């Protein structure tokens, strides 16, 4: 069921599906290709249940190729997809076959998949496939963008044989349009099961923040607002058991405390309710408004579900308790305000319990119930009926409720602008805001949509699994490395919140960090919110995602993927590959471990500011510096032996792997440091290194460099004293094999060559913390020559 899905991933190399698709939207290789099997798969299962024709057609198609059903159907469009979008500029389609033979699938249907892709039916056999193939296909077009464009596309294109023939497997199409709420996400996956069901038949598909898109049985019940109204009426209270859990206690204190009275006057009412010290008790002696709150004072501000249910599970909880005593409350605490006893009232104060029948009268208060307070349960309704009027409209579904004419109705909400008779929906959201969605939040938008049928499966758990950042592009599969990422899978999804009808889904940051959060969303906390984010793209398929404490707040299309926020800085921004994007934030990933371990606990705050400044600095001239973007300038201990050697030391291979590929720049300047790394080991042997015995003749070169008397030489007159001082002092410390000092000058000449390019470009003061950087991850580079496997 969510297996196919697995071997997928196993088998796409990690950079495989990474890999930007079309030029058009931010669509990743593996996003578009795992979606266009996934509802590929759901397509046929739809076709299983209602067509018994093409419920064997499909059977017997298995039985053709040996494959089992379910898993016949998704690989093929998988595959198909992959196969179309090997019209990517190489076409180098030999990749396939490495796939085929992780798949171990037969040459046969894939020989059948490309005269699927290109050419026609295979056969009569394989109609459904060629049909699900193509519907999936053409509903992730590059940027389907509407829901409406979806039909336009339809009919308009080839994709209409496929429609004429959808209708002979007593099968339709439908859609209705939904806007993203709060409200909506949360009761999203409730509808899906309920209204959506196989049991209807509806088997619903792929939204597109638009809206839904469905499918429709022949003959099944049609889509009816009715329920869609009268599902939030339930949702929309939160109705918590513990929500009735306090009155239970509440109204409970108020009584028990009387038990000794309250089971007396089951006979001689007058025993009790009249005193020989006078004629009768105040309604205070029997019920002080010391431990008694009145009703309506208890039941502050509920409706049904809790109001009614406080009402019925509330009137009758432990109401098989003192039935008798009981009754008091009601016939006395009815509350202030509303005396209405509304009853059978004597009008007697106090004598009225004698002249009054037995418990048998009881049953005629249980009467007056369902009546004043199932008004509020039809009360607020048009307030929100107006969305199902506006907001949930356009639909092939058939409004069920009445007009909004409701004569004269309250003023319309200050900001959820809807009429009242602010609006409760905000103070719902409010509430909610509280604690069960915490600010801030992760948003992540998917391009043109993303199937349903996968949005109830993706999950994660980080508590364990903390931040991890090593991967490889070719090395680790797709899947392998999602593993490393801590993605989880569960069809009963429990730390992810999706927005199903608004094409993307929301993280409360809460299950991501146990950080404190902040009541918004600041630059200082956003530092630390980072080093989570690359990782959930990649947990979904290569997705761009935005962090923000307004969930309403609309993500700003390259063809490449987007890590943002409320504010962007320098170094977020997108290279040009997704491949490279997700490691200039894996970059900050190892960066923020070490950081964690260097910095105090509060010390952290200050110094992941600075980085952050830092790192947004060197990324504005060259990407590549961004990547070695560690400080070595102002406002961090330079304490090298309390800063690399602590914890920079193990993730510097990796950094410097990032390094370098992030540009042209910055291989050449891995590949200079690396060599004269490798050259060092060589000349000094021994591991007694000091800081100062390795890096004095860089300065020295470097400080004559910048030496003002020689700056006036020309590029190449400069390059040459600073490279010349430089290895003279090497020379002076330790001699140099003619051969072996070769390897050093030709490198340093292109570092002090970019130097002077990174001074043509900013300024030579800013050159200066650059120089500084490359100085201390010389050391670093030299350290790591000596790793030699050292735990
Ligand atoms: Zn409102």
Redesign the pocket.
């Known amino acids: 069921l969510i297996g196919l899905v697995r071997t997928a991933l196993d088998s796409i190399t990690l950079g495989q599906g990474v890999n930007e698709a079309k030029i058009k939207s931010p669509q990743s290789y593996a996003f578009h290709t795992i979606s266009v099997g996934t509802i590929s798969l759901d397509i046929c299962k739809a076709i299983y249940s209602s067509s018994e024709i093409g419920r064997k057609q499909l059977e017997n198609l298995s039985k053709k190729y040996n494959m089992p059903f379910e898993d016949l159907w998704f690989y093929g469009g998988f595959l198909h997809d992959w196969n179309k979008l090997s019209g990517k500029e190489e076409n180098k389609e030999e990749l396939t076959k490495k796939i085929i033979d992780k798949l171990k699938l037969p040459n046969e249907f894939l020989h059948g998949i490309s005269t699927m892709a290109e050419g026609h039916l295979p056969d009569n056999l394989h109609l459904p496939l060629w049909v699900s193939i193509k519907l999936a296909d053409m509903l992730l077009i590059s940027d389907i963008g509407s829901v409406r464009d979806v039909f336009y596309f339809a009919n308009s294109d080839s994709y209409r044989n496929a429609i004429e023939a959808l209708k002979e497997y007593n099968l339709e199409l439908n859609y209705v349009s939904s806007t993203f709420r709060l409200f909506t996400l949360i009761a999203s996956k409730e509808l899906l099961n309920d209204v959506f069901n196989e049991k209807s038949g509806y088997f619903p598909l792929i939204s597109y923040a638009d809206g839904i898109v469905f499918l429709k049985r022949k003959n099944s019940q049609p889509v009816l607002l009715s329920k869609i109204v009268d599902l939030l009426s339930r949702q929309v209270f939160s109705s918590s058991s513990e929500v009735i859990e306090e009155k239970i206690s509440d109204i409970e204190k108020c009584i028990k405390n009387k038990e000794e009275l309250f089971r007396q006057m089951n006979i001689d009412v007058k025993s009790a309710i009249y005193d020989e010290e006078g004629k009768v008790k105040q309604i205070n002696a029997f019920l002080p408004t010391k431990v008694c709150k009145p009703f309506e004072d208890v039941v502050g501000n509920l409706d049904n579900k809790s109001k009614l249910q406080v009402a019925r599970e509330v009137i009758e909880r432990n109401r098989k308790d003192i039935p008798f005593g009981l009754l008091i409350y009601f016939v006395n605490k009815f509350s202030k305000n509303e005396e209405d006893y509304i009853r059978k009232g004597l009008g007697i104060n106090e004598k009225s319990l004698k002249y009054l029948l037995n418990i048998g009268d009881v049953q005629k208060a249980l009467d007056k119930i369902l009546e004043l307070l199932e008004k509020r349960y039809a009360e607020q309704s048009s307030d929100k009926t107006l969305l199902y009027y506006v907001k949930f409209s356009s639909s092939g579904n058939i409004i069920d409720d009445l007009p909004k004419i409701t004569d004269r109705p309250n003023d319309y909400?200050?900001?959820?602008?809807?009429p009242i008779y602010?609006?409760?929906?905000?103070?719902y959201?409010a509430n909610l805001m509280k604690d069960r969605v915490k600010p801030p939040y992760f948003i992540v938008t998917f391009y043109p949509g993303v199937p349903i049928s996968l949005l109830n499966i993706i999950d994660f758990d980080f508590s364990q699994s903390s931040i991890k950042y090593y991967i490889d592009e070719e090395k680790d599969t797709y899947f392998t490395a999602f593993e490393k990422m801590g993605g989880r899978l569960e069809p009963y999804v429990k730390k992810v919140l999706p927005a199903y009808f608004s094409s993307k889904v929301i993280i409360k940051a809460s299950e991501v960090s146990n950080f404190s959060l902040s009541t918004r969303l600041s630059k200082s906390e956003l530092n630390k919110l980072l080093p989570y984010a690359p990782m959930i793209s990649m947990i979904f398929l290569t997705s761009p995602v935005l962090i923000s404490s307004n969930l309403y707040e609309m993500p700003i299309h390259e063809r490449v993927i987007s890590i943002t926020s409320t504010y962007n800085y320098t170094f977020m921004k997108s290279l040009n590959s997704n491949l490279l994007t997700l490691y200039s934030i894996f970059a900050y990933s190892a960066k923020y471990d070490a950081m964690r371990k260097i910095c105090g606990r509060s010390d952290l705050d200050n110094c992941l500011g600075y980085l952050t400044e830092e790192m947004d600095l060197y990324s504005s001239v060259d990407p590549a510096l961004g990547v070695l973007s560690i400080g070595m300038g102002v406002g961090t201990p330079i304490d090298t032996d309390e800063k690399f050697f602590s914890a920079f030391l193990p993730v510097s291979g990796y950094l410097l792997k990032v390094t370098g590929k992030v540009s042209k720049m910055g291989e050449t300047l891995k590949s200079s440091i690396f060599s004269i790394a490798y050259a060092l080991k060589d000349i000094i042997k021994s591991q007694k290194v000091s800081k100062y015995d390795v890096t004095g003749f860089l300065r020295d070169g470097v400080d004559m460099f910048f030496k003002t008397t020689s700056v006036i030489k020309d590029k190449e007159d400069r390059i040459g004293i600073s490279v010349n001082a430089a290895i003279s002092s090497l020379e002076n410390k330790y001699a140099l094999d003619d051969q072996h000092r070769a390897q050093v000058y030709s490198a340093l000449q292109d570092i002090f060559k970019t130097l002077y390019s990174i001074e043509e470009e900013s300024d030579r003061s800013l050159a200066i913390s650059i120089a500084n950087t490359l100085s201390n991850w010389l050391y670093i580079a030299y350290k790591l020559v000596l790793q030699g496997d050292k735990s």
């Open positions: 909400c200050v900001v959820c602008g809807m602010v609006c409760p929906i905000c103070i959201e």
